[PDB]
Motif scaffolding. Structure first.
Motif, PDB file in Angstrom:
ATOM      1  N   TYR A  66      32.206  16.655 -20.621  1.00 53.04           N
ATOM      2  CA  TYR A  66      31.035  16.698 -18.914  1.00 53.04           C
ATOM      3  C   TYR A  66      32.628  18.092 -18.500  1.00 53.04           C
ATOM      4  O   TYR A  66      32.325  19.192 -18.181  1.00 53.04           O
ATOM      5  N   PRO A 108      24.413  18.231 -10.382  1.00 54.36           N
ATOM      6  CA  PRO A 108      23.045  17.862 -10.114  1.00 54.36           C
ATOM      7  C   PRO A 108      22.876  16.495  -9.583  1.00 54.36           C
ATOM      8  O   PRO A 108      23.977  16.342  -8.742  1.00 54.36           O
ATOM      9  N   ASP A 115      23.303  13.369  -9.349  1.00 51.28           N
ATOM     10  CA  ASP A 115      23.275  12.086  -9.802  1.00 51.28           C
ATOM     11  C   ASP A 115      25.535  12.889 -10.202  1.00 51.28           C
ATOM     12  O   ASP A 115      25.058  13.202 -10.776  1.00 51.28           O
ATOM     13  N   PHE A 124       0.975  -1.258   0.243  1.00 51.13           N
ATOM     14  CA  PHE A 124       0.064  -0.555   0.336  1.00 51.13           C
ATOM     15  C   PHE A 124       1.057   1.087   0.125  1.00 51.13           C
ATOM     16  O   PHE A 124       0.518   2.122   0.264  1.00 51.13           O
ATOM     17  N   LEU A 161      28.408  11.757 -12.821  1.00 52.34           N
ATOM     18  CA  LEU A 161      28.587  11.784 -14.230  1.00 52.34           C
ATOM     19  C   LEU A 161      29.137   9.904 -14.431  1.00 52.34           C
ATOM     20  O   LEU A 161      30.498   9.982 -13.573  1.00 52.34           O
ATOM     21  N   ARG A 162      27.983   9.163 -14.874  1.00 50.00           N
ATOM     22  CA  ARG A 162      28.731   7.432 -14.672  1.00 50.00           C
ATOM     23  C   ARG A 162      29.066   7.114 -15.964  1.00 50.00           C
ATOM     24  O   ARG A 162      28.932   7.887 -16.783  1.00 50.00           O
ATOM     25  N   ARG A 210      33.301  10.764 -22.943  1.00 55.56           N
ATOM     26  CA  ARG A 210      32.752  11.662 -22.225  1.00 55.56           C
ATOM     27  C   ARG A 210      32.943  13.095 -21.571  1.00 55.56           C
ATOM     28  O   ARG A 210      32.281  13.553 -20.809  1.00 55.56           O
ATOM     29  N   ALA A 256      25.646   2.169 -18.832  1.00 57.62           N
ATOM     30  CA  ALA A 256      26.225   2.563 -17.700  1.00 57.62           C
ATOM     31  C   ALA A 256      26.643   2.062 -16.518  1.00 57.62           C
ATOM     32  O   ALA A 256      26.877   0.538 -16.525  1.00 57.62           O
TER      33      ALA A 256
END
Lengths: 118, 125, 8, 51, 52, 126
Positions: free
Chosen positions: A108, A39, A41, A15, A43-44, A104, A60
RNA sequence: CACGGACCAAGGAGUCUAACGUCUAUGCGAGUGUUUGGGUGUAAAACCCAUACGCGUAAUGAACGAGGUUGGGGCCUCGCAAGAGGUGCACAAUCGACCGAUCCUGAGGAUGGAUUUGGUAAGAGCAUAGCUGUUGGGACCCGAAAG
RNA sequence: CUUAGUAACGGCGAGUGAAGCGGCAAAAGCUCAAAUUUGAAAUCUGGUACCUUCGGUGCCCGAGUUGUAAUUUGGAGAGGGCAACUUUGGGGCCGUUCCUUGUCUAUGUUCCUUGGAACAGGACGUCAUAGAGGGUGAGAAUCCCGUGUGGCGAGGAGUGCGGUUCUUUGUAAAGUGCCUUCGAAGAGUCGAGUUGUUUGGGAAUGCAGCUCUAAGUGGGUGGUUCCAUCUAAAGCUAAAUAUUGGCGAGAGACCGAUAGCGAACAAGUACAGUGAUGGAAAGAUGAAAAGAACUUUGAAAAGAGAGUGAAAAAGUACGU
């Protein structure tokens, strides 16, 4: 059937699902308020999975390897303060994955701005 | 047993046509409407093409009581018109692109009240 | 930074 | 063509501007489907009770 | 735009407007058509006069 | 339409919060409207009621009567107006337990605290 | 025979859940299943969604013609009705084809040659709801020599 | 969530039953041992006098060399030279964030009819980011309490951060590149045989006991002739995670005095048991008790008149 035990004694009906989503949204909003500039999270990295039944899918990763960070123009200790996850126990084998991670990291770095200590 | 208003209207129209025309085609078509979903398997577009492959069947009209499902094992389709209650998106698109046409049972009855040149197909059981 | 879950 | 309902201002005057039907109003009305869907949707807003 | 008429996208990827199984709900209009009326055999008074 | 999540609209909760409300809160509960003659000057629509005040009756069998407040009975939410009484079979006078929500204040006391509250509630004595 | 019945008001006995199945209604359909989770929100309501995942679509890698015949709802042609012919739906009977696969083979060591065979022979399944079929959960109710 | 009711167990009979990977909520990593500070035990508990008192300074005593300070630990690390390589804290004050808490924040009680009473029916007006809810002698937006809305304060937590100011400093403390010289691995522990238990874990899954006991280019587990991952026997860590217990709140297609917690009330109370314990029944007057003034009957319970009230068909044994 798999009910010879006293299963009735442990039956958790979910519930809380309706309220759990709202609680998670409120927690995310609180983190955004506290972590407004950065952010929610880190950067992965992009990684390739084992278990060939799934290796064809790109996914990732946990954190960039030390070699990837070094090739990205910064250090693991410094990269952590910038929000880039670093994995000290991950070893790069595939060259394409390493190149993608480096690209990447470069993107970034180009897209980030760091406030002065003042 | 169904409760669709359009299905009931079609059933009434087909019953009226069958009783006021004595054509066995209308009676056969109406009798099929009283069949459950299990008793009305869909007819694949490949089956429609196979039925049209018969001698002189290209010019005949094809009527399917069930749902006309698409088939990926065929590329060319005859330039024929298929009338059925339910038309799948893929099958409808293939029929339209192949120069064919799709219509409902009421339209077929209007064009052919006695079902002239009509062919009835049903799915395998 | 990661891909957003679900729609946007 | 697709008839267009004239836009009515706040004063109730039929403005010359009109918009064609979005074709949604031409969809097949299925009272049975609507009733069946409602009978299940209305049950989603409920709370459990027990002795 | 939200429901996607034939000329525009719906924005609900994986959905399309329902298709009618009958072209026209007015069965009387179809029955009263000239073609069907000519192809339809004549009917009686609809009331059976009692006999004997 | 309720918007705040901190205020429940449950009937039982409201009834419980009223049948055992403290006397301090009951003081606010027993607020009564002010006569339009006074409202013209001060502007405040309603204010509490005390013994030194004067109130008028607008509803009930005692409608139309007026007089000074004899005492305030917060326990039973009853306000007793002077000269409004009932005579028992033995002739003993008994004040009738009116409610401030039905009476209208016609003369306001001017205690220091009351005067300060008048300014607090946006009033302007003159 | 007997078990129960002095009387009256209330209470009271095929109810819920997990697993599999037939039938029925609806959506899509070789695809189906939003709600484990995210966006969103008039805030447990309603509207959308990426990626994976349950089921089947290819069996034990299936186009010699994914095929000939017998019928077969209906259709067409001949006709004034009877009557005759063609096409032939599903479907049944039958002769056959290919995959897995079974003995010979000989091109240095595999093709091909005849059967059988369990499937293909042109998808038909998934999802939501109603009654209902079987088993585990106290399982219609009160109750037994009790560890 | 799936994996999966699968792998797998199961006098292979009932039943039991995972784990990899994949989809998602959250992410933070670390600290010791083992290296000499040896050009200075540079460390700290405690008492005492002060202060800018969750602690700081001077003095004193003691703990420690059988090791207190600094760096570091598989991502390695350490001693040096080079780059005209790169950087620099705390506190006081105000504001900002949050806890508690007070307060301002709209409009009829206007007429007609009834009724014991207006909140009721009709007629005529107003607010609506306020038509959620409660009280007011019957169904109240406009009688009150209240809600939407923003706005004004006070007492605290505070270093999550936006401003003002004092102090630094010391041949002090750090970060990266190059060259150079070194470069340290946790024992009655892994393991083997056995007993008892458990797990799907037969490949003996782990656990506890018992005989013995280990090596450092050494060792655990798995797969093709070797191969891949860690390298334990030392320790700390926020968030997703459970919540029939304690605190405060938002709600229910739940029950409504033989129902619902045993207890809607004087309920874990009366009551029983030498005792652990067992363990109940019982709600409603009316708006205000306005609860029989007063006369008569008998000593009284109360009866007969009178009287209050909408109703005494409400009489304390009182909604119907």
């Amino acid at each position: 059937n798999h009910f010879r035990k006293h299963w009735q004694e442990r039956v958790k009906v979910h519930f809380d699902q309706a309220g759990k989503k709202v609680s998670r949204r409120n927690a995310r909003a609180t983190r955004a308020a506290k972590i407004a500039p950065r952010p929610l999270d880190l950067l992965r990295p992009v990684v390739r999975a084992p278990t060939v039944k799934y290796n064809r899918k790109v996914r990732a990763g946990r954190g960039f390897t030390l070699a990837e960070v070094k090739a990205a123009g910064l250090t693991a200790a410094y990269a952590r303060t910038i929000g880039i996850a670093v994995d000290h126990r991950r070893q790069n084998r595939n060259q394409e994955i390493f190149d993608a991670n480096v690209q990447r990291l470069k993107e970034y770095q180009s897209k980030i701005i760091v406030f002065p200590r003042n | 047993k169904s409760d669709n208003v359009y299905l009931k209207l079609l059933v009434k129209l087909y019953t009226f046509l069958a009783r006021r025309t004595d054509a066995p085609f209308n009676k056969v078509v109406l009798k099929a409407l009283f069949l459950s979903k299990i008793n009305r398997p869909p007819v694949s577009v490949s089956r429609i093409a196979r039925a049209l492959k018969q001698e002189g069947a290209a010019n005949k009209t094809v009527v399917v009581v069930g749902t006309v499902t698409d088939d990926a094992r065929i590329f060319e389709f005859p330039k024929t018109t298929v009338a059925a209650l339910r038309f799948t998106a893929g099958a409808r698109a293939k029929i339209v692109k192949a120069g064919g046409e799709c219509i409902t049972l009421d339209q077929l009855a209007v064009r052919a009240p006695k079902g002239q040149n009509t062919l009835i197909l049903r799915g395998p059981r | 930074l990661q891909t957003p879950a679900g729609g946007k | 063509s697709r008839p267009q309902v004239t836009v009515h201002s706040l004063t109730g005057e039929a403005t010359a501007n009109a918009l064609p039907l979005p074709a949604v109003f031409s969809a097949p009305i299925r009272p049975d489907i609507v009733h069946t869907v409602f009978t299940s949707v209305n049950k989603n807003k409920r709370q459990a009770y027990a002795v | 735009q939200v429901w996607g008429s034939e000329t525009v996208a719906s924005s609900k990827v994986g959905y399309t407007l329902p298709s009618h199984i009958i072209s026209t709900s007015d069965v009387t209009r179809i029955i009263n058509s000239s073609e069907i009326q000519s192809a339809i055999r004549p009917a009686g008074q609809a009331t059976q006069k009692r006999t004997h | 339409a309720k918007q705040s999540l901190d205020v429940s609209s449950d009937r039982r909760k409201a009834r419980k919060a009223y049948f055992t409300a403290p006397s301090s809160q009951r003081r606010v509960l027993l607020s009564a409207p002010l006569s339009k003659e006074l409202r013209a000057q001060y502007g405040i629509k309603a204010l509490p009621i005390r013994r030194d005040d004067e109130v008028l009756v607008v509803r009930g069998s005692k409608k139309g009567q007026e007089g000074k407040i004899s005492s305030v009975y917060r326990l039973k939410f009853a306000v007793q107006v002077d000269k409004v009484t009932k005579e028992k079979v033995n002739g003993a006078s008994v004040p009738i337990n009116l409610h401030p929500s039905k009476l209208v204040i016609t003369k306001l006391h001017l205690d220091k605290d009351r005067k300060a509250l008048i300014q607090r509630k946006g009033g302007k004595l003159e």
